[PDB]
Write a protein that binds this ligand. Structure first.
Ligand SMILES: OC[C@H]1O[C@@H](O)[C@H](O)[C@@H](O)[C@@H]1O
Ligand SMILES: [Ca+2]
Length: 769
């Protein structure tokens, strides 16, 4: 490996061998079907609301999130980088697809597949990833840095459906070597969203943009139809000329054929035919190829940028609504703009790299933090782009100031912005894209007094319930299978209108969003104040025994949606205390004296009773009425965790909080698989895991990172990092279960998982407050 020295990969990048097999991988531990796309994954490409494309560590473009809200894992074999090298003095050169695998059928059989093992590495530190190619039959060493411009406090480039591939080539040998790098791409119009004739009308064109000191050559892969539909638009690939390289291209090769129409050209001398051909296809799949060729002398380095864009302007949801994606604000809505996007990237990528470096640098340069923590912190952010992210710039056919936003909880439970989960998972948005965060919270504010009297069947017990109750915060803002933003509470396993955490979490999120953006946004507190008051007032009505605290009803009426709570619970009870304290403070800020006084009164009574009912000398009991009410819950003081973040002070005595956290570390962490797998949710005082429900026996990744953040603010530095390290290890390490770029909600002691690609572990960003 002589190429690593010519590029700059941070030491905290996650690493794996190209073609590496992983032997320890986990699988779903539930009885119903659940997504398991394997451990062959990578950092995604694509902006927020753009649709994303997962290119895996083996080099394939395989995890397709271009249909917004859906996860489709299938390698499109035509989409690759390939290399040709010939040493001056040899009769023949060699050509190789940079893909550690081969197609399942006979398409593209002429291409040279099966990039060999032990011949290169993949590295990731989101939004950047890299591949290095160090192969005994390739005298010139190559590396590529690939990324999309995901930039905090930037709502523009961050939305773009674009990726850059910056190649570096170095000749460590003592002979001249001719090198070519080729990007191939299938015209994927019709890959989704087209019910019949899936390739029909697809055609490819070549754009040559020549102006002083710029030449870009690109393929634009579109369809002859000018219809405005979810399925129509354009893909583009292309390259910018640099001194010392020549560009060649092929406009049309057949992807549903043996590939030799292209490969016979490339494998001969690394130079394509430059054949334009706009003839549309009927049944056959088609693709384009863009290549560069250059000669490297001994000791010479060259850098060359390629790019990929996709202009698919319309997203459609299963309930019928069609919306424009956010990037259309910057490039237009007609779906004929892939070249403009590609050009913007090829002309600005150096600036983008520097903007990404500038935001990562404060963390990366802090030598008090271990590298493993940096690996997790940055790579967990993959989910902001990969989570079915929807960001609208108008409804199609619509005759507004704001752009609605939604991140899925996950793909198996296909719900937008699940509030009980975003309480943990939304930290990166508030910290790094706060205008999006405030938009999402205003969306929730607007739902508070919505009433929907239609009924649904509750999944857990079969009872009928009202869809949406006035004054109750919704569980979610809909499903991609239905009508995001329009039809709320798609979730139906339990009835969220009787949950005891949603209304409190809502309030806490509101105050969080004010505090963590500088305590300056009074307008945001003004917009949300009525809903905050309404939310707390409605929750107060659920106090059945006048102790001043809402009663859990002996069923799962909160985020642990199979784990029953009854009476006053540490979890919902502490959230309530904190939410009352937050509402007092908002009342002070907005000079609503009667609100301040009322919530202060409720707080003092509830606080006194919470401590009496639950403090047992060592920790706070799980609740007051359940069969295992004395279980040690990992999340027992969630309200105090948020109070620390919101700077609301002590809601419970410092000494008692410290004792509780120490007990959780001693038990839920250190007595669960020797503290190497996170914090298990429920443990009995005798040190055996609580078996009352599956959720008690799970580690929740986002709960564990949040608990780590809580320990950290409370000075328990070693315990905080040791607690988080188990989640990092399970996710990323060779000794783990292979969950990189698909961090799940939960695992059990055997390492197997529930709900890969989950929002909650974005809570790791709470460790940076
Ligand atoms: O793992 C528990 C989670 O399951 C999901 O199906 C629900 O939508 C969440 O509200 C819940 O917290
Ligand atoms: Ca009560």
């Amino acid at each position: 490996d002589k190429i690593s020295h010519k590029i700059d990969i941070p030491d905290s990048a996650w690493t794996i061998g190209i073609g590496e097999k992983f032997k320890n991988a986990g699988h779903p531990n539930v009885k119903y079907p659940m997504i398991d796309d394997s451990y062959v994954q990578g950092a995604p490409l694509g902006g927020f609301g753009a649709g994303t494309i997962g290119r895996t560590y083996n080099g394939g473009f395989s995890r397709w999130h271009l249909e917004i809200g859906k996860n489709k894992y299938t390698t499109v074999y035509a989409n690759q980088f390939s290399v040709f090298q010939k040493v001056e003095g040899n009769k023949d050169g060699v050509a190789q697809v940079l893909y550690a695998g081969e197609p399942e059928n006979g398409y593209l059989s002429s291409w040279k597949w099966d990039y060999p093992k032990e011949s290169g590495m993949y590295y990731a530190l989101y939004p950047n990833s890299w591949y290095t190619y160090t192969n005994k039959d390739l005298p010139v060493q190559l590396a590529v840095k690939q990324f999309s411009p995901i930039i905090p406090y930037n709502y523009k480039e961050t939305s773009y459906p674009v990726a850059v591939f910056k190649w570096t080539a170095y000749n460590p040998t003592n002979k001249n070597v001719d090198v070519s790098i080729m990007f191939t791409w299938q015209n994927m119009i019709g890959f989704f969203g087209k019910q019949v004739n899936v390739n029909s009308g697809n055609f490819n064109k070549i754009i040559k943009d020549k102006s002083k000191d710029s030449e870009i050559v690109a393929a634009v892969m579109g369809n002859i139809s000018n219809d405005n539909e979810e399925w129509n638009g354009e893909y583009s690939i292309g390259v910018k000329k640099v001194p010392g390289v020549d560009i060649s291209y092929k406009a049309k090769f057949v992807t549903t054929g043996d590939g030799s129409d292209l490969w016979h050209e490339f494998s001969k001398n690394g130079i394509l035919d430059n054949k334009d051909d706009e003839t549309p296809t009927k049944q056959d799949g088609i693709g384009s190829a863009i290549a560069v060729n250059f000669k490297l002398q001994p000791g010479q380095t060259i850098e060359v940028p390629f790019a990929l864009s996709w202009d698919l302007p319309i997203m459609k949801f299963g309930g019928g609504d069609k919306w424009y994606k956010m990037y259309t604000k910057y490039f237009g809505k007609n779906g004929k703009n892939s070249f403009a996007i590609l050009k913007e990237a090829l002309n600005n990528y150096q600036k983008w790299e520097k903007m990404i470096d500038d935001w990562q640098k404060p963390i990366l340069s802090n030598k008090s933090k271990p590298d493993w923590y940096k690996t997790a912190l940055f790579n967990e952010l993959y989910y902001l782009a990969d989570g079915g992210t929807a960001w609208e710039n108008g409804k199609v056919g619509e005759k507004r100031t704001n752009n609605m936003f939604g991140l899925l909880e996950c793909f198996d439970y296909n719900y937008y912005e699940t509030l009980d989960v975003r309480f943990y998972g939304s930290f990166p948005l508030v910290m790094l894209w706060p205008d999006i965060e405030k938009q999402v919270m205003r969306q929730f504010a607007d739902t508070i007094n919505v009433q929907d009297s239609s009924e649904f069947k509750v999944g857990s017990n079969g009872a009928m319930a009202v869809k949406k109750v006035q004054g109750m915060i919704p569980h979610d803002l809909g499903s991609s299978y239905a009508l995001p933003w329009i039809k709320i509470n798609a979730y139906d396993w339990q009835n969220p209108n009787i949950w005891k955490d949603l209304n409190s979490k809502y309030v806490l999120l509101v105050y969080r969003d004010y505090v963590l953006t500088g305590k300056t946004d009074k307008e945001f507190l003004k917009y949300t104040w009525k809903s905050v008051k309404t939310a707390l007032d409605k929750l107060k009505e659920m106090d059945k025994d006048n102790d001043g605290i809402p009663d859990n009803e002996g069923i799962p009426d909160q985020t642990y949606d199979t784990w029953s709570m009854k009476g006053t619970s540490a979890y919902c009870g502490s959230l309530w205390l904190a939410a009352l304290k937050a509402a007092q403070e908002i009342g002070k800020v907005l000079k609503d004296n009667e609100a301040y006084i009322k919530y202060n009164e409720w707080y003092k009574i509830a606080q006194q009773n919470f401590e009496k009912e639950l403090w047992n000398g060592e920790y706070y009991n799980f609740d007051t009425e359940s069969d295992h009410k004395d279980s040690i819950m990992a999340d027992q003081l969630a309200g105090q965790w948020y109070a620390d973040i919101l700077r609301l002070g002590d809601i419970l005595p410092k000494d008692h909080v410290q004792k509780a956290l120490k007990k959780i570390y001693e038990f839920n962490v250190m007595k669960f698989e020797n503290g190497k797998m996170g914090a298990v949710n429920g443990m009995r005082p005798d040190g055996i895991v609580d078996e009352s429900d599956i959720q008690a026996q799970e580690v929740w990744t986002g709960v564990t990172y949040a608990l780590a953040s809580f320990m950290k603010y409370r000075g328990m530095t070693e315990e905080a990092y040791n607690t988080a390290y188990g989640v990092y290890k399970m996710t990323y390490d060779k000794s783990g279960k292979g969950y990189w770029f698909r961090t799940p909600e939960a695992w059990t002691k055997d390492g197997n998982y529930r709900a890969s690609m989950y929002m909650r572990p974005l809570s790791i960003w709470s460790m940076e407050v």
